[PDB]
Write a protein that binds this DNA or RNA. Sequence first.
RNA 1: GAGUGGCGAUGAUCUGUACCCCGGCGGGGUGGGUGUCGAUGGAAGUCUGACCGGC
Lengths: 122, 367, 227, 157, 124
Amino acid sequence: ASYVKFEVPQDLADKVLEAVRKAKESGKIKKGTNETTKAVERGQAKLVIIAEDVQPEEIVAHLPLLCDEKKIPYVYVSSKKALGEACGLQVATASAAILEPGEAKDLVDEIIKRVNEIKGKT
Amino acid sequence: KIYLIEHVIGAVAYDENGNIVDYITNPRDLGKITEELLNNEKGIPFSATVELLKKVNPQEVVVENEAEVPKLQALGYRVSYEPYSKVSRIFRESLPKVAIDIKFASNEEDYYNFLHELSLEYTRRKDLLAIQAVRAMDDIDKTINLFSERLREWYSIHFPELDKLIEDHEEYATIVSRFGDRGFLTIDSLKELGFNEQRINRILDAAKKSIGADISEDDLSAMRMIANTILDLYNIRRNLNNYLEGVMKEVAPNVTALVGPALGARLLSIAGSLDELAKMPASTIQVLGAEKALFRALRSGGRPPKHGIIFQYPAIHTSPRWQRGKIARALAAKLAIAARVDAFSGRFIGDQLNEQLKKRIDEIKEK
Amino acid sequence: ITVKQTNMENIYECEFNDGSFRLCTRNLVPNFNVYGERLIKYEGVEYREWNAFRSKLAGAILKGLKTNPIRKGTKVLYLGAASGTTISHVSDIIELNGKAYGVEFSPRVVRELLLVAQRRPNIFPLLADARFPQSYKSVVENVDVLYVDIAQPDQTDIAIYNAKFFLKVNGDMLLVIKARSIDVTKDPKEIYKTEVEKLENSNFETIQIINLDPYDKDHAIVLSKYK
Amino acid sequence: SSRLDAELKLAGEFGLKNKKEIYRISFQLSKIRRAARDLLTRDEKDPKRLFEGNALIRRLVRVGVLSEDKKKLDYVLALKVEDFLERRLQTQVYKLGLAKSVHHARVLITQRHIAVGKQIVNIPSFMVRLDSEKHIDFARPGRVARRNAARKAEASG
Amino acid sequence: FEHNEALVPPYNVLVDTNFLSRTVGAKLPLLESAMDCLYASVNIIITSCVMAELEKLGPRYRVALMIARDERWQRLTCDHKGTYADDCIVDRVQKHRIYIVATNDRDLKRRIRKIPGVPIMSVQ
RNA sequence: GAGUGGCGAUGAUCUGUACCCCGGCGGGGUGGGUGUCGAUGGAAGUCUGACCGGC
């Protein structure tokens, strides 16, 4: 897919889905592309999670561009059904956002730092 | 030893002291500069630089960029490069000024006008008309109505009964435009625009029994100037719609599939651009227009608008008040997707989008 | 409502219908907003609301930035201009006299910068990599302020390199330190200290170091003078 | 004082994790010998440095250790203290939804409830490793954990 | 003590001139000593004023200097090397109560305890 | 034996519960604010008077 900027290994993808679940429980998340958008536009989001199997690709294509302007890190997962079902929904979701990590702070900080390494940085 | 500079301004040779030994000014042409800058990236020297290295005949030359070195060696010179050299700095320190000195522009005022447009074009290389058009269309709409309102108030001094008899502004205007006086009105001339049997009779009877004023030819033609302007605007409007349709299908086909050219353009206008519309959440798109209503709600915690400029979509304003918010919400959602497929490239998928939308509307309507 | 000047040129505060205070700038292109910001008329002059949560400069001001080196007719090199949020506000501040050179290497985003820069003669957009100032050497001039907000691990080094190319001696550099995009592992506060040292071990004279909290998590902005 | 502001620090960790004592003392000493013996690398690659290597390095751990690197585990002396802390149910069992917030957690850890995939685990300071199995078990049944499964999206760290 | 903490590995430790002399003429491994007591990676540094002072001592007491100019301690480029070692460290730690200080100057330590959040190390 | 028709981010819920009414729903009215414009509508509703100067 073309709106996917970099490569996420499955270990990281699983650590992301975990991070989201703990954030439902102990913090505050936003679920769905529109709500994720508003979370970036408002600067509330600490981490943005985008699914790789969105079916018209362009639905989430604006997020990489938007997150870079607001300097909010974003990450990919492979299944939208899996992200939504993480999110506490019984339906799929195309993108989500973590606003407050709560009991996942340590878990998120490792993610936002692994995606830095496999992006360039130091 | 000659320190060589390349800039939009041209090619300048400096000595080690920072004095212009010789220069060759570039042509003030967006096309050629842009290309030479793109070419410079790969190490290709300006053509102004080639001419300058001939006029001066220097043994040891030093350039700004390391990619240039091997190109100028192949041209016959012994060459090196210094990165952030004192000379290169010396040049840029006086760069507002030395544009005028080497006669690249007459004044500072249009060095910056040019450089701004170079930058614009240079990054363009690495929807506005749709917006303008609809904005003018909206001006014309507004004006037609203002003039028609005026005309009826004015022309009714002479023929008051005609106002409640002709609903349609264009028709009303056509009558004043072709006739002026009400005693010039004929079964023949009125048939010659397609007014129906029964209506022609009611008009002529109303003109016969009119309690209007008898008025000079000077007075009537004054009025008729407005009538003809109204008629002119209607034609201009219809022309603008077709133009708008042309551009809108080209620039944002999926959006246009959903709401039509006009309303589509209208959203672009409020958003500012297509890419800006594309970055929006549905919940914004749903309220664009209606800013007064929105911020009133946000300041006070009151009830928000269900719909902004989107109100114009036939399915909304024709539907009963309890259906409208749902229809709006569904539309906006689809528009956000439409704008995004339109923005981040190409494909027409407006048919399924419409189909999904009409499914959502049919459900809303069955309650 | 009431609008009045502040200690800094072309930067204003509003008293509001309810009693809130928000930063704003004098609208260079009246009737037109770059992001969603509120437009406000007072005594027949229009101002653009400057949301601190989006713009790091507005943040730094609200956290007590001593003296702002960006004013009327200033020449700024803006590294990491992005979509044009903050740069549009420095365009308002700088006015037609001054000039802003916006460097940005993400095409997806320069897309939206273009729109901002069309409307504004102040701003000269550049799709280039701030790591190679050679690739825009030939469009820019030397400047008074080097405003640097780029997500890169070696962001500081990039900034210093641009500085020795374009920053005037005795000019000022506003450098945004992004802890989490230098290293998500390290402590933000250890990072601020070690990056400032890079500026000092070059020759930048640290004037003020602000922490952008509430407004930007794990961020600090440094103001310093190049020698 | 540094003594003082320390006696601050400790109380900070006192629910930076969840404890109520000087288990901060426990983990502390740990960090010592871990480092200590470790830091006594010294040395070379003595076939010893070898076994000890992938050895202490096989501190990992799950919920435990680092992530992927080292060698130099003194990083832990930084972490460990400030990391080894989490890991165990004492921590990484609130950070998994079930637990409403540390406190509202240890209590079930104890109070029969909260069990690591078969068998409870009252030892309200176990350690986690390959966690995905840290459910309620319960065996009318463990109530507080069985329906308040808001952890159905506890994708955390 | 109401002091909010944010120290992270590697600890930054300023070593003063007295400590350096001391550890040298008694053979105490200063680097390993700090990693031992701090139980984490440490960046060991010395201000230019401290090492300058050593430089004077070095005219008749060779040995401190080399260890003190070692990469292990990395130079902290202060703006005021001319100020007694004591005042140098004080003015550097007064804005950065972040760095740990290892000094044999019980006078410098006393006035640093005042500042919240300054680990203090020394050799008995 | 061949082709179709099959929950789902490419997206369900929450609040405009308006009031209450007659037969969750039909219809009803009263509501909100909002789009239009209007009316003629409603606004101390229509300044001041002693002397002004030139000399």
